[PDB]
Amino acid sequence: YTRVVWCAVGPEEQKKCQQWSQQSGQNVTCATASTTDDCIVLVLKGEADALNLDGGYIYTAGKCGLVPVLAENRKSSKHSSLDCVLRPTEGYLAVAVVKKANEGLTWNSLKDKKSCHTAVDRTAGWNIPMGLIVNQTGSCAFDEFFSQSCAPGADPKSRLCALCAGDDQGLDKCVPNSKEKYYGYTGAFRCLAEDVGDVAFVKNDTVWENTNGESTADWAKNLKREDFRLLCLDGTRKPVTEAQSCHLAVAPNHAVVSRSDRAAHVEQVLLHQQALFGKNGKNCPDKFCLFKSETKNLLFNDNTECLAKLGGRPTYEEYLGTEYVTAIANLKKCSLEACAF
Ligand SMILES: *[C@@H]1O[C@H](CO)[C@@H](O[C@@H]2O[C@H](CO)[C@@H](O[C@H]3O[C@H](CO)[C@@H](O)[C@H](O)[C@@H]3O)[C@H](O)[C@H]2NC(C)=O)[C@H](O)[C@H]1NC(C)=O
Numbered sequence: 001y002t003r004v005v006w007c008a009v010g011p012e013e014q015k016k017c018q019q020w021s022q023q024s025g026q027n028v029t030c031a032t033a034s035t036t037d038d039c040i041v042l043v044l045k046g047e048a049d050a051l052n053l054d055g056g057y058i059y060t061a062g063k064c065g066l067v068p069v070l071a072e073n074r075k076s077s078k079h080s081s082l083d084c085v086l087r088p089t090e091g092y093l094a095v096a097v098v099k100k101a102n103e104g105l106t107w108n109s110l111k112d113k114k115s116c117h118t119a120v121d122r123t124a125g126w127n128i129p130m131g132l133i134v135n136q137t138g139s140c141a142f143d144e145f146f147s148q149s150c151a152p153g154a155d156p157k158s159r160l161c162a163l164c165a166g167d168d169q170g171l172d173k174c175v176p177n178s179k180e181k182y183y184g185y186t187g188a189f190r191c192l193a194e195d196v197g198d199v200a201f202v203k204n205d206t207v208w209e210n211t212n213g214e215s216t217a218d219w220a221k222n223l224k225r226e227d228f229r230l231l232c233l234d235g236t237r238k239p240v241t242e243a244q245s246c247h248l249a250v251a252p253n254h255a256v257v258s259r260s261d262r263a264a265h266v267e268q269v270l271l272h273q274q275a276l277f278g279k280n281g282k283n284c285p286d287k288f289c290l291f292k293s294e295t296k297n298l299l300f301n302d303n304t305e306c307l308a309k310l311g312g313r314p315t316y317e318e319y320l321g322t323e324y325v326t327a328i329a330n331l332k333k334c335s336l337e338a339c340a341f
């Protein structure tokens with residue numbers, strides 16, 4: 001039993017996974033696919049064991065019978081005595097971010113603007129903002145709301161992909177993987193930072209992690225926090241320090257999923273793998289760090305302190321929360337219970 005097959009999304013995650021595989025002495029090995037959905041399918045077929053997923057994807061995986069195993073836990077300021085692995089998770093803040101210099105843009109004037117999204121089907125990047133927009137407009141035509149977008153996973157010829165840039169060669173425009181310039185938390189924030197889009201749908205952490213010298217990357221080197229504003233649901237604009245009072249939702253943390261039959265073994269191996277290559281890992285600083293990838297958030301978010309135990313042995317619905325689950329279901333009525341594959 002003692003061999004885990006991880007699923008990497010796109011070639012950059014594949015490279016990191018391969019490095020992890022070498023360092024783990026083949027206790028972990030690698031399968032790779034072009035999209036998160038394709039990785040879920042590999043897991044369903046039994047051709048991979050597990051991968052770490054945004055909540056929108058957990059919904060897809062869970063409808064197909066896959067179960068939550070361990071959750072990303074970032075640093076906090078409550079439960080400070082408990083070990084990270086045993087500390088409850090707090091969830092992240094889904095936000096809408098704009099330029100300060102884009103004056104007079106508010107939640108209530110987004111129609112016909114230009115948007116940047118992590119990917120179709122993701123929590124902060126898609127399910128939350130598009131769910132809110134569908135409800136408020138009373139329309140399922142969320143594909144005509146913004147003039148142009150980068151929403152990796154959408155039809156490449158459509159307005160929803162028009163602002164996506166693809167790779168160095170301009171290949172893979174709008175692919176939902178790290179090859180697409182504007183993919184994920186960091187890519188969607190870059191899309192806003194470079195003024196390609198008017199609004200980015202990301203999380204609070206993303207803004208902090210890519211401003212005021214936190215990044216060193218060329219697009220991010222020179223970005224100042226005061227040059228960004230958050231859009232509140234009441235139509236107000238706030239500094240990025242006010243995220244606790246100006247967010248779109250609180251999201252369940254990204255989490256590892258697997259087949260029920262493999263969950264116990266995946267959990268055992270991962271707890272051991274992080275003891276070696278996690279935050280204070282025995283071999284991290286030094287040989288390999290599983291939670292770093294120079295802000296590219298590959299396999300796991302770079303702000304992950306550890307993978308934490310769940311408790312209550314939750315179903316995917318209990319993990320995501322009834323609130324969020326119904327919000328996703330309601331949104332998916334635009335595009336009632338079954339596996340998508
Ligand atoms: C988009 O609009 C949807 C329809 O109004 C909405 O779904 C509704 O969500 C609410 C709150 O989550 C549910 O109301 C629930 O209220 C309490 C929560 O403790 C429960 O005791 C009730 O049993 C009930 O479930 C509605 O049931 C639900 N409506 C439907 C028809 O599914 C979405 O939340 C909206 N989406 C977003 C992103 O805001």
Ligand SMILES: *[C@@H]1O[C@H](CO)[C@@H](O[C@@H]2O[C@H](CO)[C@@H](O[C@H]3O[C@H](CO)[C@@H](O)[C@H](O)[C@@H]3O)[C@H](O)[C@H]2NC(C)=O)[C@H](O)[C@H]1NC(C)=O
Nearest residue numbers: 075076077093204205206208209214241242243244245303
């Ligand atoms: C929005 O996201 C921000 C980035 O995640 C986050 O700021 C971070 O918050 C933690 C504590 O909550 C800070 O604490 C860290 O740094 C101190 C010393 O500087 C250490 O003692 C701690 O061990 C810990 O590592 C982070 O410094 C801080 N990150 C940055 C780069 O600013 C905000 O809390 C988030 N806002 C909301 C409302 O949730």
Ligand SMILES: OC[C@H]1O[C@@H](O[C@H]2[C@H](O)[C@@H](O)[C@H](O[C@H]3[C@H](O)[C@@H](O)[C@@H](O)O[C@@H]3CO)O[C@@H]2CO)[C@H](O)[C@@H](O)[C@@H]1O
Nearest residue numbers: 090091092250251252312317318319320321322323324
């Ligand atoms: O505990 C069993 C119980 O779980 C309920 O769902 C919980 C999730 O377990 C929990 O993770 C979630 O927590 C947060 C998450 O960030 C967001 O959902 C946010 O909106 O709320 C929390 C903020 O910290 O909360 C949900 C409940 O909202 C199931 O609904 C229930 O069926 C089950 O019995």
Ligand SMILES: *[C@@H]1O[C@H](CO)[C@@H](O[C@@H]2O[C@H](CO)[C@@H](O)[C@H](O)[C@H]2NC(C)=O)[C@H](O)[C@H]1NC(C)=O
Nearest residue numbers: 002003022023024025026027028269272273276
């Ligand atoms: C690969 O996995 C094996 C099996 O779990 C690990 O070997 C175990 O190491 C643990 C922790 O020190 C011991 O408690 C067990 O006695 C060992 N079991 C067996 C059967 O060898 C091994 O450490 C792992 N290697 C790496 C680098 O991840």
Ligand SMILES: [Fe+3]
Nearest residue numbers: 054055123124
């Ligand atoms: Fe997410």
Ligand SMILES: [Zn+2]
Nearest residue numbers: 247248249250
């Ligand atoms: Zn709130």
Ligand SMILES: [Zn+2]
Nearest residue numbers: 312314315318
């Ligand atoms: Zn339960």
